Structure formats: structure tokens, C-alpha cells
Amino acid sequence: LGFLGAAGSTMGAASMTLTVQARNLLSTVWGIKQLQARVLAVERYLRDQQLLGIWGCSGKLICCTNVPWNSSWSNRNLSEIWDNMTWLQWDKEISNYTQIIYGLLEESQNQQEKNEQDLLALD
Amino acid sequence: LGFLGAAGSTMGAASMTLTVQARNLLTVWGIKQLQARVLAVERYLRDQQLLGIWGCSGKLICCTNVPWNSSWSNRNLSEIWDNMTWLQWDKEISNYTQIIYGLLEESQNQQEKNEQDLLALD
């Protein structure tokens, strides 16, 4: 199924269709209205791409990171998270913890970039 | 501190907080706001493309294979990173900046070709 087709599917099944929902982010009163809408869409896409960039996930749709998961955010096991849950219910569940995760990802990438730079200093 | 807070700090201290500046790069006022937004998007994308052609896409601290020429600046690392700010450095190397960019582009081209040839060595 096409755009948003894997909406009621489990996140395990839905994770294999990420390209389908990725390609649908890009395409005088009505002239100004439509240019504002198009610039809004472009800015939202670029903010998401910049946010992925500062996490070390640029160019990837499935990006593994070096931040451990904290049981406090959700203590569910992978047999429920990926096999018995949709992305909507998940996103609602970890809505209150999103900013903390984003901050941890940013700090982890900054430490990794410094570490990689030092590993190239060594002769 | 926050946005541009490290401007008076040393280069080796301001370089620790690069994401703070990076996150801030993105009718009378209808068309003016639209022009300003398109200008901001264009400048960000030009910088990202310029990083891309150098092989530094997706990174904020990117090491390259271009050697430093002592004619651009002959100060040592204890005077640049510990005893200087970024604005002073920008004034110091401004004239040679485009030259550096050209070499970076050329370096990536060679390293783009060589890597391709390795992927052809069956």
C-alpha cells in the first residue's frame, strides 16, 4: 500500500515502508498563499534533515545510535513494541519523553564526532 | 551559553558547541517574510551543498586531506585554538578562504575517483 498505507500495521511491518512516506514530504493572494505553503513544507523537511544530521543519521531512514534505552520512558518488551503495537500508539506513549531523547542523541553525536576527530589525529 | 554565546570564547572551546549555532540557521510583510524565508533556505542549502562537494555532508567537524600551507597562517596550535577567537581567525584567513575551498573541492574529486576504482577491483 502507498502513502500512509502501513498506518494500522505494527511498527515492525510499518518500518519496511519508510521510503513510501519519505517521498511525500516534497510536492496575488493565492500566489502568496501557495508560496507560503511550499516554503513551510520545505522548511519542515530541512529542519528534520538538519536534526538527523546533528544526530549522525544523515542519508539514512533506519539509523542505529549509541544512546541506551531507559526503562522509565517505557518498560515494554520488544515482543509488544514491534509485534503488537502501531506507530500512532507508540508516538502517543513516548510523547512526554521525546525532547529528552533528542537531547541525548545530540550530545552522543557531539561526543562521537570529537572521538572520531581524535582517532584521525593519531599518526 | 545559548546562540553565539561562545563567540568570545577560544576556538577550541567554541568548537565544542557547534550545534547551538547550527540549529538557528532555520502586503508589507507577506512578501518580505517570504523573501527572508527563501533567502534563509537558499543560504543553508548552499552551505550544505558546499559541504557535500567536499565530502563533509552530515558532519559538523570534518577532517580533510588538504595540507595546511604555512603562507595562509604560520601560527602554531597553541596560538590558534587556545589564544584566539573565531572572528579573529576569520579576519586572519579571509583572503585565502576561496583558495582553500578550491583545494578542498579538488581533493574530494580525486578521492571520489580513487574510491570508485577500488570498488572495481573485483
Partner: antibody, heavy 124, light 109 residues
């Protein structure tokens, strides 16, 4: 001056586990890389371990690569070395040293400036 | 380990050279050859860092050089203080980082 004061100790079972600790003073702690170098009782020197300025990077010789853990607490200006399993060849005086690596921003070292007095580790 | 003579000797007022031989990946390609003087019963101390450079505070007498895969430490008139063991140290590269030669007993006649 720069003073590196080990504490640690030495009386360990042949299959035991020990921890050394090392305090430093007289200079900015967070800007130097540190290392552990061992000297068997009457033989020459051997480099054992290397830790970066920030504590994120560890390097070991192959003979201890799966056994030793080096760690640093910059806030309390301390270095520590956790040894597990061990072996008979580990009899030595262990020394802290400042040097052996530097971040890209600063000048290169690849040598050891100040050596601490050390501590003797003997496996019975 | 590096190959380095077990002992050297000489009279006060005379100079000596302590050789130190490594391989092409060890001494030749990397010019980071430190020298350390360890008195018996004492922890070592830095006397040469890099092929030629001398630390601040160390006596001027100490010097050194590198040619091919052979490095050497050149001392001056052997004052009674200079009775110790002299160890090389070469930055091999990544993987195995540093390797430390044997001790040289420097004897004052």
C-alpha cells in the same frame, strides 16, 4: 611542581582482581592524556594503557586487551585502572604518566612528561 | 621490544653515544623517539622528546639524533649524577602504540 600520587597496593591472588587509583596535581587535569606504564622488578619498561583527555578513548596492549579497564574522573582529578584475571607476567611497578596522546586541536605529544612514583603489584 | 645495548661506559669529561635500533614502521617512519633516564629506586624522568628536541629544565648536555632506522642519544661529560638506566620509546603507530627498549647501564669510571 606536577605530582602524581598513586595509592593502590600489592597483594593479589594469581586469578584475582585489583584496582589502582592515581591522583594528580600541579596542572590542568582535563587537558592532558594519561597512560599506565609497567616495569617488572629488575627488567625494562612496558606501556600498558592509554586514556584520552575526556576519558572516552581507551587503548591497550594486546596482552591485556580483554582484561584491563582504564578510567578517568576529571571532576575529582583521578585516574584508575581495574585489572581482572591477571597472570604471572603481571608482576611489576605500575606508573602513571601524563602524555602519550593529544587531541587534534592541541600540539602533538607521543611522549610522557611526568611520571608518578608508582605502586608494586605482585601476584602470589 | 627494541634492540639497545645493555651497557655503555666512559670517563668524566668524555661523551658517549647510546644507540637504539628499530624497524621501518617504528623508527624510520615516525620521528617520535623519546629517551627516559631512570635512577635505581626512583621513577623515570623525561630527557629527550622527539629526535632532537630537549625538555625545558633538562641539562643542555643531553642531545640526540635519528638516521635511517637507528636513533641515538648523545651525552656530554659524565658527571656523577648521570648513573642510571636509559630507555628508548618509539611511537610504533596505532594498534600497538608504544614499545620500550631495554636498560643501558651508564657507568662513570
Amino acid at each position: 611542581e606536577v605530582q602524581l600520587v598513586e595509592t593502590g597496593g600489592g597483594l593479589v591472588q594469581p586469578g584475582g582482581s585489583l584496582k589502582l587509583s592515581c591522583r594528580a596535581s600541579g596542572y590542568t587535569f582535563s587537558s592532558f592524556a594519561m597512560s599506565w606504564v609497567r616495569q617488572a622488578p629488575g627488567k625494562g619498561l612496558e606501556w600498558v594503557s592509554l586514556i584520552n583527555d575526556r576519558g572516552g578513548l581507551t587503548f591497550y596492549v594486546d596482552s591485556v586487551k580483554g582484561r584491563f579497564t582504564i578510567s578517568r574522573d576529571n571532576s575529582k582529578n583521578t585516574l584508575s585502572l581495574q585489572m581482572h584475571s591477571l597472570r604471572d607476567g603481571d608482576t611489576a611497578v605500575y606508573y602513571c604518566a601524563t602524555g602519550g596522546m593529544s587531541s587534534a586541536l592541541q600540539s602533538s605529544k607521543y611522549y610522557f612528561d611526568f611520571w608518578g612514583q608508582g605502586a608494586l603489584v605482585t601476584v602470589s | 621490544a627494541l634492540t639497545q645495548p645493555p651497557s655503555v661506559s666512559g670517563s668524566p669529561g668524555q661523551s658517549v653515544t647510546i644507540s637504539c635500533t628499530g624497524t621501518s614502521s617504528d623508527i624510520g617512519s615516525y620521528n617520535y623517539v623519546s629517551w627516559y633516564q631512570q635512577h635505581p629506586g626512583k621513577a623515570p624522568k623525561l630527557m629527550i622528546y622527539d629526535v632532537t628536541q630537549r625538555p625545558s629544565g633538562v641539562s643542555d648536555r643531553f642531545s640526540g639524533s635519528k638516521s635511517g632506522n637507528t636513533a641515538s642519544l648523545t651525552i656530554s661529560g659524565l658527571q656523577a649524577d648521570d648513573e642510571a638506566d636509559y630507555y628508548c620509546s618509539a611511537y610504533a603507530g596505532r594498534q600497538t602504540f608504544y614499545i620500550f627498549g631495554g636498560g643501558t647501564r651508564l657507568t662513570v669510571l
